[PDB]
């Protein structure tokens, strides 16, 4: 009662301005993204030239996949930390995440800077077509966007390919909820 009656005097919101960072922040994010893209290109051409040597107990594809995966992971984390640095004290996203009442730091990094890598089954987007994730890419491509790394933020807006790959990613979560509602509590119904 007392907190709501005070909140009338204070008030709380969320706005477009709460999702805006500095132009310097966007520039730094874009520099990090281009750095990560160039690094993934280096790993791809190394694997192409048979210059990538596999790690022990792992095939060359596993080594390459783990390398590019961790490259995208630390690129995403660096961009997220830079976005977190750019937040103001009045940013309602930071108000809702620091309080812990809703959202998380990952959500802020998603909305402001980088949605990030999509996944199905714990891997990048598979070649549904022969050696191609979509017809818009060339055959035998393993770049980030070609295998389904979203680079824009939600505010920046997804590209068509990135939008479709994120739809594929969310379909996995919807399937997870469906099989949850199927198999939830049958364990409990036997246990009781």
């Amino acid at each position: 009662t007392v907190i709501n009656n005070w909140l009338l005097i204070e008030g709380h919101t969320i706005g477009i301005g709460d999702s805006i960072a500095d132009s310097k922040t966007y520039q730094d994010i874009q520099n990090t993204i281009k750095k990560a893209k160039q690094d993934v290109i280096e790993v791809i051409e190394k694997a192409h030239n048979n210059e990538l040597e596999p790690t022990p107990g792992n095939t060359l594809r596993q080594t390459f996949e783990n390398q590019v995966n961790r490259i995208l992971n630390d690129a995403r984390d660096k961009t997220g930390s830079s976005a977190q640095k750019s937040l103001s004290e009045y940013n309602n996203f930071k108000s809702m995440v620091v309080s812990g009442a809703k959202g998380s730091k990952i959500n802020i990094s998603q909305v402001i800077a980088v949605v990030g890598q999509q996944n199905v089954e714990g891997k990048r987007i598979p070649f549904g077509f022969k050696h191609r994730t979509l017809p818009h890419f060339i055959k035998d491509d393993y770049g980030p966007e070609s295998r389904g790394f979203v680079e824009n933020s939600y505010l920046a807006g997804l590209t068509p390919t990135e939008f479709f790959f994120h739809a594929m990613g969310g379909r996995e979560g919807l399937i997870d909820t469906a099989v949850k509602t199927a198999e939830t509590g049958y364990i409990q119904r036997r246990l009781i």
Partner: protein, 526 residues
């Protein structure tokens, strides 16, 4: 490919697929395959020239059609199998253009990426600024909205129908809507929404509406039901007849009023009726007579709107009766954005109680800010901003998904041109004290849809009503009445609580108390 593009021997749905790695050509002309149009590209150049577009612009009074573009071999249908053998271009304006070439051999180019969307997903403004589970939620919910489902609904007599009093085309709309005919049959209202915390009735995905706006017809709708009944002379044992019965001629009857009906055993339209009344006075002759008249579903009231009388396929006189019932928005009615922001009406406040801007503008709806961060419906915020800009600019905005020319920066600049905060945050005054609210408030028009679920449609109680005939337990018949499943999980919860007497009451005394005499030497019922 030449002949298909010329349509000489090959109709333009036959797909030809050349697999080089296996040295095979498969040609399919069967039904059941799915294809889509695609523009043809040669020498990294479109075959679509500006003269074709000029011929398209004069479509009427020219008789130039899409089939000419099919005939000229500029656009061709491609199926999913043949798509494997295609190097497709998303957009011609950059990808086929010379650059540090990602690819230098593009055979086809897409007409527009937004056509990947569905029929009920295409209405989403800025769908590429939302978490795709929200897009699935909106696709599901848009089918559930209220609106003018068809123009001739007045003549139709459907089972259940909903009509919104004052529909509006969305202020922010994708161009695809122009071909949906949803711009001409809209379903929803553009309403001023302010995303802000308040007294505490908006929380956990709820919404606080302006009572005054509802009193001005905001989101007011009508719900039409239709009942039907036929008579018949089946054999000679029975003959149902439309006629109002009386206790003096029908020696078996239900306690209710019957004076609403006329001499034909039917109710005149324009009579205001409750759920327990009779709409069709109809009775069967015992082998005096007994009633089997038709009552209303005993959870509602309405007006018998239209009574039609005709003959069935056999020729027996049968009648349908459409009953109107106005539905004012009330607490618990479910409203949704075009971004999956589903919420029930938490409370209604009059205009003076509601907050308001410096110009006297009050918000029609107030939603919890905390609905946004986890869901990440940023398309909702951009839709609100673009709606504000369109309304101030007096021109229907654009909501094409992948239109690169539009972004929040330009929208903010356009908003700043009209003497508003560029991000849409506004100073609002508390209606209870008039004090400036400390934090500023994001506000603007947003398209909201009254979903077809209302509380009076889904609410009931059980107070020792019409029990079963097989187990004497409450049954679902004549209404939602029939109690509730006291499922095994509820029993188990009471075992955890240890409320054994409460469990006994719910399972035995409150459901089907019975007793039987049994022998004390054998278990046989006496």
């Amino acid at each position: 490919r030449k002949l298909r593009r010329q349509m000489d021997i090959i109709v333009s749905e036959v797909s030809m697929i050349r697999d080089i790695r296996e040295r095979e050509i498969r040609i399919y002309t069967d039904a059941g395959r799915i294809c889509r149009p695609l523009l043809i590209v040669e020498k990294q150049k479109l075959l679509l020239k500006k003269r074709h577009i000029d011929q398209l612009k004069e479509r009427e009074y020219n008789n130039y059609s899409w089939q000419d573009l099919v005939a000229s071999g500029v656009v061709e249908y491609i199926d999913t199998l043949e798509e494997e053998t295609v190097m497709l271009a998303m957009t011609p304006d950059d990808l086929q253009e010379k650059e540090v070439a990602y690819c230098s051999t593009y055979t086809h180019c897409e007409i527009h990426p937004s056509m990947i969307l569905g029929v009920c997903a295409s209405i989403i403004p800025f769908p590429d600024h939302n978490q795709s589970p929200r897009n699935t939620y909106q696709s599901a919910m848009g089918k559930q909205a209220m609106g003018v489902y068809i123009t001739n609904f007045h003549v139709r007599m459907d089972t259940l129908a909903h009509v919104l009093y004052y529909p509006q085309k969305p202020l922010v709309t994708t161009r695809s809507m122009e071909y949906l005919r949803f711009r001409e049959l809209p379903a929803g209202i553009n309403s001023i929404v302010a995303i802000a915390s308040y007294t505490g009735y908006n929380q956990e995905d709820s919404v606080i509406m302006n009572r005054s706006a509802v009193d001005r017809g905001f989101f007011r709708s009508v719900f039409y039901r239709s009942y039907k009944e036929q008579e018949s002379k089946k054999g000679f044992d029975q003959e149902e007849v439309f006629e109002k019965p009386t206790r003096e001629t029908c020696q078996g009857m239900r306690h209710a009023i019957y004076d609403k009906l006329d001499d034909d055993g039917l109710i005149a339209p324009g009579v205001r009726v409750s759920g327990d009344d009779v709409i069709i006075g109809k009775t069967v002759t015992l082998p005096t007579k007994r009633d089997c008249s038709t009552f209303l579903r005993t959870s509602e009231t309405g007006i018998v709107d239209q009574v039609m009388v005709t003959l069935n396929q056999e020729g027996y006189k049968f009648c349908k009766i459409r009953v109107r019932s106005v539905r004012i928005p009330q607490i618990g009615d479910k409203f949704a954005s075009r971004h999956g922001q589903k919420g029930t009406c938490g409370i209604q406040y009059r205009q003076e109680d509601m907050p308001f801007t410096c110009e006297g503008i009050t918000p029609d709806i107030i939603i919890n800010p905390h609905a946004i961060p986890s869901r990440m419906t940023i398309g909702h915020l951009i839709e609100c901003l673009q709606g504000k800009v369109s309304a101030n600019k007096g021109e229907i905005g654009d909501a094409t998904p992948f239109n690169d020319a539009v972004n929040v920066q330009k929208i903010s600049n356009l908003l700043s041109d009209y003497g508003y905060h560029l991000r849409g945050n506004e100073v609002l005054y508390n209606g209870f004290t008039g004090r400036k609210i400390t934090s500023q408030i994001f506000i603007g028009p947003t398209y909201y849809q009254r979903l077809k679920h209302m509380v009076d449609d889904k609410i009931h109680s059980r107070a020792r009503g019409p029990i079963q005939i097989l187990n004497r337990q409450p049954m679902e018949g004549r209404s939602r009445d029939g109690g509730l499943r006291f499922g095994e999980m509820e029993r188990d919860c009471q075992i955890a609580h240890g409320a054994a007497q409460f469990l006994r009451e719910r399972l035995f005394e409150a459901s089907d108390p019975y007793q039987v005499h049994v022998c004390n030497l054998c278990g046989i019922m006496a």
